[PDB]
Design a protein around this nucleic acid. Sequence first.
RNA 1: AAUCCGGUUAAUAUUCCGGAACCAGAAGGUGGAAUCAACACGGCAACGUAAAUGAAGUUGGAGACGUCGGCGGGAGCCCUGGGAAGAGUUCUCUUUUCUUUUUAACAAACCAUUGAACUACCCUGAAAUCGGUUUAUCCGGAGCUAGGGUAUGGUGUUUGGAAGAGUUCAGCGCCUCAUGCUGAAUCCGGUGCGCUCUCGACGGCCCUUGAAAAUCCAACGGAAGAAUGGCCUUGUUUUCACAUCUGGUCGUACUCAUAACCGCAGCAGGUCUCCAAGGUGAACAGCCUCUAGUUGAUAGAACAAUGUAGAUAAGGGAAGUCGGCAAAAUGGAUCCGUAACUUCGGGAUAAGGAUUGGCUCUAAGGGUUGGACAACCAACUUAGAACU
Lengths: 99, 93, 69, 106, 50
Amino acid sequence: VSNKYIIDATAAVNDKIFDVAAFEKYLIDRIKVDGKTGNLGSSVVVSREGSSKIAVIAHIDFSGRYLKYLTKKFLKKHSLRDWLRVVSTKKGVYELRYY
Amino acid sequence: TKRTKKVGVTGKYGVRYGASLRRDVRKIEVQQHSRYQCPFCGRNTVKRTAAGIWCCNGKGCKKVLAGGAWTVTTAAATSARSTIRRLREMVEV
Amino acid sequence: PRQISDIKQFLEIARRKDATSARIKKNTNKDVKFKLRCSKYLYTLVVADAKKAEKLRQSLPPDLTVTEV
Amino acid sequence: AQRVTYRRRLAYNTRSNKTRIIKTPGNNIRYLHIKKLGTIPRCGDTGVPLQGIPALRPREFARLSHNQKKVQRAYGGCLSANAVKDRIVRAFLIEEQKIVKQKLKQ
Amino acid sequence: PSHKSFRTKQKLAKAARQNRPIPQWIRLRTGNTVHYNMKRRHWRRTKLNI
RNA sequence: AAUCCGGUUAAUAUUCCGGAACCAGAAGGUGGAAUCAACACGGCAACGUAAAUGAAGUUGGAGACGUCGGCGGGAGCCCUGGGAAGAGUUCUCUUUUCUUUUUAACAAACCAUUGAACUACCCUGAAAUCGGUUUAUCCGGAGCUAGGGUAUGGUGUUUGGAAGAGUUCAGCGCCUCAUGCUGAAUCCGGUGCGCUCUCGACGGCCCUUGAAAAUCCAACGGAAGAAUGGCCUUGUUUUCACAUCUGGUCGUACUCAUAACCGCAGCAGGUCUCCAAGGUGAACAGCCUCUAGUUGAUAGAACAAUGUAGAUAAGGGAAGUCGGCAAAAUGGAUCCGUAACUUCGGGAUAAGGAUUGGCUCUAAGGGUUGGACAACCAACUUAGAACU
Ligand SMILES: [Zn+2]
């Protein structure tokens, strides 16, 4: 039982508009398991960075819609909305486009 | 609980129509809504339908009897049956 | 619409004169539907094995008009 | 939610205007006019419904095969099994009573 | 009422045809003074009465 | 007697298009069955089948029927837990909020399984220490309980129809043309004194017992029939299956109303009926909201008297008036209590008193369940306590 949700931001990473380093900590500090947001123990959702594709590995049948919701939360917090929009391409794969 | 001192089935009529009329109706409806015994089946399943027709249910003896308005048999009809029975015997013998 | 489950019965109803056209429908669940358009009824056969489907196609009357949708 | 209209010009809830709600393959909720329920034929001697015969409208019986409208027995599809048995026993006994009456007369 | 007999429909067709504007050349005919006509009927003013 | 789905027009759709069906009528190519002689078999029965000859005459059934009340089932709607796609909000919080997640007629097989009769009938057997059983008291030596069967069978299940349709989302041609092409998802679950419709088994009421006919089916009955050189050849089977042809005529637009009808009118009047979301709430009450519709009732400026409609008013409380006219007052629910009189049924919600919010808890009342225990899921009530 494992999932490999992927979010891609190559549209803004190469343009130096997106901060995956802050996106790492935002996901880590805002992912909620069993109510509280501090239930990360490597037997649960783990985060990984490739400087262009943020990876969320799960073992508790996670949902990608919550991942998209948190990405939109980060988008509005950093005021990158109206320029970047998150869309779905593959199963468990989301990417940011300009539209 | 008794639920009624004397009106009984006429409790549906409330306080109207008069006590004597309610009492007469009470006696009639008590006779009318009574289960009777089929003279051919021996079961207490005879019920009235439409003022003079009496039927009993079951797998057998689905007969329909022509009776009185609210009783299966009336005293006058029983007396007439006895009189006709007597006259028939005198004629035959 | 009627459904058949017998391969030989479908072959006989295909060889029947009233059989005019056949349709091949492939589903995402690796199943092939053979639909025969007769005068009165449309007859559907469901095949789950591609190996059996290939031999069924080969054994089908070549003179019959068969199209794939 | 979706609301439906009559599909015919009869605008009243008559016995001939029975309708059923259907969900078409277009996510459309709409009426479907249906006929009245059929009736099982009744026994001619006791009035009980006849076993083994479907319930259909009078005209629908013309399209059924012969064996679906009857029972393989004397008076099948017209009288019940108990009624047929009672008639057979009653017939035989009364004919016997006639025979013994004639024999006793002679 | 959308449920009309053939006779009713034919009468309605006749009434509709006897409602058009008059061509001017007939009015311009010498010795012909048709000109304007009050025979024009409106559905909301004068009823046909079947 | 018999039709559905999707699409299409500026205006028509169960009528057109595409697909898929059904009914009636007319004639009549097979085919199995049975016959070297008559028109099939199976089941101890209810009864069943792919056909399984049937003229009159007669009989039976369907058509074909009231009303009310409760109970149970189904379809649609409502509600709810996840996943997927898109959108809204994001000072802060919200694994968040909103939209979609669809399967028609027709055909086949099962049908108390998976939900729902012991509903009707049949076989074994013979029951008092009587038993079975509904929410509701009915059933049984005229054969109970129990066991096993038969029939009734869809708005139930699995399929075909049928994903190829429709819906949602996301890209490429970019003057784009007949509007084309390329991608995905359309999934898994649950719930109910819920609403509408319908079906099934019941009960109550009548000095009320709640149409007719066309038409269709079945039965009793036996009119009529002609193969034979043990093997080509015909009569039934077209109430079996499949196949061919035909289905004429009239209506079909639109309004159905605070503007398409009537009222002299684009009149605050009148005119029969179908569908009826969420919350609060007993509720189709009142109030707010979703879908849909409308923002149409000559407008602008200012608040004189008197008006029309709505409110309030110290103290008194009907002194007003023909007259408590009008208005005010009471009002839901729960818990106490309730007189005279009476036709004993009522009066009665008599009269007269107390409580009602929020929050945190407690107790009781019910449904499948691993080795008398018991791990969760899925539910609404009632009562009480503390705090504020
Ligand atoms: Zn009796």
